[PDB]
Amino acid sequence: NDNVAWFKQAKYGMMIHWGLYSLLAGEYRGESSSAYAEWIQSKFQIPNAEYGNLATAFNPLYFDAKKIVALAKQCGMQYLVVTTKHHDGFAMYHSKVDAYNVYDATPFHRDIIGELAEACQKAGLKFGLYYSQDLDWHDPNGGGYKSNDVETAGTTWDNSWDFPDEDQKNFDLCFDNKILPQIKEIMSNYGDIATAWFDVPMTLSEAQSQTIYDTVRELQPNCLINSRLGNGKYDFVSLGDNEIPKFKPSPLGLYETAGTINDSWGFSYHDQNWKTPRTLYRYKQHLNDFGINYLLNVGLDPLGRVPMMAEENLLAAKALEDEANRL
Amino acid sequence: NDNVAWFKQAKYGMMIHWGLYSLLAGEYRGESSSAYAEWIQSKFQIPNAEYGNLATAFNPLYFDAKKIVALAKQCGMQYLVVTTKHHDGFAMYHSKVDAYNVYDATPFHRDIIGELAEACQKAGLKFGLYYSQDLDWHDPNGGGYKSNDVETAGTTWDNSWDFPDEDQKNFDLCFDNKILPQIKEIMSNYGDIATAWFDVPMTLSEAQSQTIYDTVRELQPNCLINSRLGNGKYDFVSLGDNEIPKPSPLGLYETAGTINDSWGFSYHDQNWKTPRTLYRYKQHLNDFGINYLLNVGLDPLGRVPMMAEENLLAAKALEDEANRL
Amino acid sequence: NDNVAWFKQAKYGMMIHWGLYSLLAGEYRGESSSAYAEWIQSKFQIPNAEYGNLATAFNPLYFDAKKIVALAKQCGMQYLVVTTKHHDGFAMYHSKVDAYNVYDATPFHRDIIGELAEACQKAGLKFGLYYSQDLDWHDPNGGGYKSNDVETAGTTWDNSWDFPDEDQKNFDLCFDNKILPQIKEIMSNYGDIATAWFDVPMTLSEAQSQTIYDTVRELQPNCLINSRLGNGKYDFVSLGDNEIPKPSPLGLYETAGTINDSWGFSYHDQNWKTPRTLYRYKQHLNDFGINYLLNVGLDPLGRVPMMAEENLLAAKALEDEANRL
Amino acid sequence: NDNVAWFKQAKYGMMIHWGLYSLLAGEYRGESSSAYAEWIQSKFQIPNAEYGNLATAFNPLYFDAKKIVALAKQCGMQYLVVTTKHHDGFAMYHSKVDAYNVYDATPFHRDIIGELAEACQKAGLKFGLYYSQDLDWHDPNGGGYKSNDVETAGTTWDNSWDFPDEDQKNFDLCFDNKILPQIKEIMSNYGDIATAWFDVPMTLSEAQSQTIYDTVRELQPNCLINSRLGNGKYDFVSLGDNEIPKFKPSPLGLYETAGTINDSWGFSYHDQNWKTPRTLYRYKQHLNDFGINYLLNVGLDPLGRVPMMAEENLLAAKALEDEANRL
Ligand SMILES: C[C@@H]1O[C@H](O)[C@@H](O)[C@H](O)[C@@H]1O
Ligand SMILES: C[C@@H]1O[C@H](O)[C@@H](O)[C@H](O)[C@@H]1O
Ligand SMILES: C[C@@H]1O[C@H](O)[C@@H](O)[C@H](O)[C@@H]1O
Ligand SMILES: C[C@@H]1O[C@H](O)[C@@H](O)[C@H](O)[C@@H]1O
């Protein structure tokens, strides 16, 4: 494997949230999203017809995988993880199985995952994928319809507005037709995938969890899978803020905490609550000392840019880090 | 022209800055614009080739002149003034004379000035136009090339990067071919224009100032022109805040400002004047017989920023509350 | 006790956090408190010797109970609830039982609770008290030493730095000697208390919960007590926002919140809820028959922060506007 | 002199604004000061009776000249300049001539200038003084009463509210009785003064300008005086933002631009518009390349602390600077 050895010593990674949600940028008809701008479709129950039409305005002229990967490399990040497809159900790659994707639906007409995969290969960074394997707001039988007992960063976990008939929904339809095929797609194209990032099942069955584990193993034998997929089908445990030293057995000794620079994963115009360089550097050092990789999220803006203050704070966090390691 | 009487009593107006600059939103290649985001092309000397290409990404799905004018009406604004064409040289209307415009250059493929003109006619709001009659960064002979002695919200007043040869530039070429024709266009289409908003000439000759005055008078006899055009060719003086006490023959005055510190949308500028600040300034200007022209900088999807809307509406509630007492 | 009828229809109340924590204002030796600035002594384990010395610098020249209650009245708040004594153990009234209080320890040399109680009586506002009946960081046997299993807005629930010997601490000593006497003090002086606001017991026994209930009932028979004290010793349930839909026999409910993210004043916390957010939340809570208890964290000079005042007043104007429609 | 040689190569200095204005912290009776919080007494025409009473609440428990000078030293600042007395007329040293001072008027009962002077001597930093030699809002005949033709960061340049009789004011009374004696005081006590920082005369006569120049020369022969005092009585020209490369002859080749981290010189609770580390570092490098010392102001808070974000941004600016000089 020795992908295991590399992950123990990686320490630092860039995460990217980017999708149709990025264009709305935390705002819908003069009202604010929750802290999570990427959840805006659920928050305002925006009809798929309307939300999907955002694709017609997706033309990020300043997107540049080379420049993004370079920034990651300059901050000493050793891997990059991207949203291939979030809860909204929109793919950021050229999906054969669903035309609801950046390549087919947008004037941009380009494979974002492909460009990042290539930028990473040439730069010598490992490449990881995020995929929402349970929630899909574009799919009539998207997940979450049997677990609205608990509150969300939107309204409901499922698209309950376009598809209200909760007692006639069947996730198997969504899983077989979109979910598994799309996982096969991202895991076969775009070369070696170092890390695989799934959500916690609400809907997805035990069988269906095992299936995704097998699929990834067969197509990407070196790919490290994160705890979220399901118990006993992972190679590193993803820890939440509430789980970090001042429980899920991890047999390989591999741990990763994800966070954002501000309070949103997706870009949000109103969210300027950027963690200071010192906060970023200190948290990284704290996580690293406990043998935990820091996966730090950038939410790209409508033109596909790292926000100015996100870049500034990553670079100043790097200078504080280097200064401290010289002492 | 009872337009004079109406302006004395108007008290409040919406101004709109919107253009290609709105898409960059105060940011270029990881660096910040000045307080003035609309000046970003000059600030970073962005080649016309590149800046112009922003047009290919201009698709403001949420633009809605009816909803914008409704907001203006609800805040008790009696007129609306829009950027037809700013220093960058990009027209926000269907220009016959230049294809560098929202209708021809953008997937949106719609006349912004036309939609606002109509929304205003139906809502019963007077309609005013802003036009950069001197500065044009898209025109080889754009203005400002004989007055870089003074600092700007960008680098230079003219496009000195695409068109460096300052000693072979001739503003007459730009004026005759783009400026005057475009003024004729905006003043003839889009119905009655109540207010005309020009910049202070740096380059534009005395003759050329008189020409624009005549053109507006002949096409829009009721249209009130602002002091900026040149001395003795105006009907109201536009005041800066630093010029109100404690040279206008009609007794008509107007101070323009923005809610934050930028005229164009700027995602880094969240320094919104509070409702109380907005309401108090309006009351101060009105008591001195000065119309408050308050700018909204629409975002890439053609939306009034959430906090701009909130603060206009809360300023209105403070104002109404105070008039009930 | 028509106090029940009055609380069902009260709808809106001011809450006040104020203490030694207010002087540090979210900051200690170049580092930030948590969202809760009032928790700063626990957050940085500041020795009582040092923290207590803040009392020597407590001289809020601009404190004015009349002006504070007037603001509350102008926003249509019908009651006011104050911190008599928070987790830090410092009394904001002239306590016979402990000299660790605003009157005895500070150059200000005045009873804050007394001035507010009087300002409220004269203004026609009901007066409520908050008291930390379990946690006391100044008391060797302060509460929380048997429940550090769970994380806090500081470090530990108890003062574990000045008083580390957890296995030789006895809350009974603190309860008998400081807690019950101080409750007797605040409930006997300062006239009628409409609302009594306690914390959730971590340490405090079943007996000790019943005792406080009895004490309040005997001294203040009209006083409505909140659920936090313990099950079956309350007259209204204090709800968290996450517990309102889409266990109270009198039908009385109250949700408390702050304008920014801190209860105590925090100079770094400028995340003020907009007027619209405040007005809408109030309307939402009121429609569900829930009183909105909205916290102000007074600053070192005893002032309502400028933006807290602005946003309460603008929230009031939005509310009045909406009721006129 | 070779104080001249040292100033050419100093590059960086800390400035401190601190006074009664610091306690109000940009706010008076629910209304905001201008960008300049230190100007608040003029802005709201606060009677001397009331403003002066702030002295009774001045007890900055966390003031620590050693820690302040240490921070300055860690950022590579080579000198420290303090407000001995600002426009409000309140001395921050033990003045024999006026009891309106930190030592006599406040429960703190300590000489701030003295503690900083000592902290600097022991740390090996040069020590400089600011003094408002024209404006004094506490003095009946304070300056500015013949130049209200122009707007200010308050209302008027002079105290025109406590002392309205403009046509019966005489600056000579103020100059002879308070100004010159206080300059003699600060220049004789607190040891060697490296830099002397005066305001531009509005009121102060040509004679009176020459007098202050002579006084400083006789008491502090090595002390470099800044252009503001008056034409031909200075050793370095202080440049404003509008005067810095993309005029006052400077014969020694010595230049200094002062600025603050946020938009206020005095502490202001509402002013969180902190210049980012990159902005601070870049400006410093720009000024230094043009042979201009950067004098960067900290506005101490009511407890005598460097604001958390001021400290963080100075330290991160230092790390960016060191990183860039390694390359
Ligand atoms: C990283 C975060 O994990 C959560 O489960 C998601 O709901 C958020 O949108 C985000 O992707
Ligand atoms: C309203 C403002 O007037 C100024 O002169 C212009 O330069 C700005 O860009 C803006 O249009
Ligand atoms: C109102 C809030 O209730 C909580 O329980 C307390 O811990 C906070 O400090 C604050 O008093
Ligand atoms: C450094 C600044 O210089 C100006 O002249 C003063 O008016 C300000 O208060 C501040 O001291």
Residue numbers in the entry:
A (entry chain A), D (entry chain A): 2 to 247, 265 to 345
B (entry chain C), C (entry chain C): 2 to 247, 267 to 345
Question: Could you share sentences copied from the article?
Answer:
Lactobacillus casei produces a GH29A α-fucosidase, AlfC, that is ~104-fold more active on α(1-6)-fucosyl linkages compared to other linkages. This enzyme is particularly relevant because α(1-6) linkages form the basis of human core fucosylation, which significantly impacts the function of glycoproteins such as antibodies. AlfC is a single-domain enzyme that adopts a (β/α)8 fold typical of GH29 enzymes, with an active site at the center of the barrel. Our results suggest that AlfC employs a conserved hydrolytic mechanism with a specific subsite that accommodates GlcNAc in α(1,6)-linkages, while AlfC tranfucosidase mutants work by shifting equilibrium between open and closed conformations of an active-site loop.
To better understand the catalytic mechanism of AlfCWT and its point mutants, we solved the X-ray crystal structure of AlfCWT into which we soaked l-fucose. In these crystals, fucose produced no substantial conformational changes, with a CαRMSD = 0.14 Å between the fucose-bound and -unbound structures. Fucose binds in an orientation identical to other previously determined fucosidase crystal structures. Specifically, H18, H87, and Y131 coordinate O4 of fucose; E39 and W40 coordinate O3; W40 and H88 coordinate O2; and nucleophile D200 interacts with O1. W283 and W198 contribute to a hydrophobic pocket that accommodates C6. However, there is no structural evidence to support this assignment in any fucosidase, and Oδ of this residue in AlfC is ~9 Å from the nucleophile Oγ, with no plausible access to the reactive C1 of fucose. Its location on an α-helix with very low B-factors suggests it is unlikely to unfold to move closer to C1 of fucose, while its hydrogen bond with O3 makes it far more likely to be involved in fucose binding rather than catalysis. In AlfC, Oδ of this residue is ~12 Å from the nucleophile Oγ, with W198 separating the two residues.
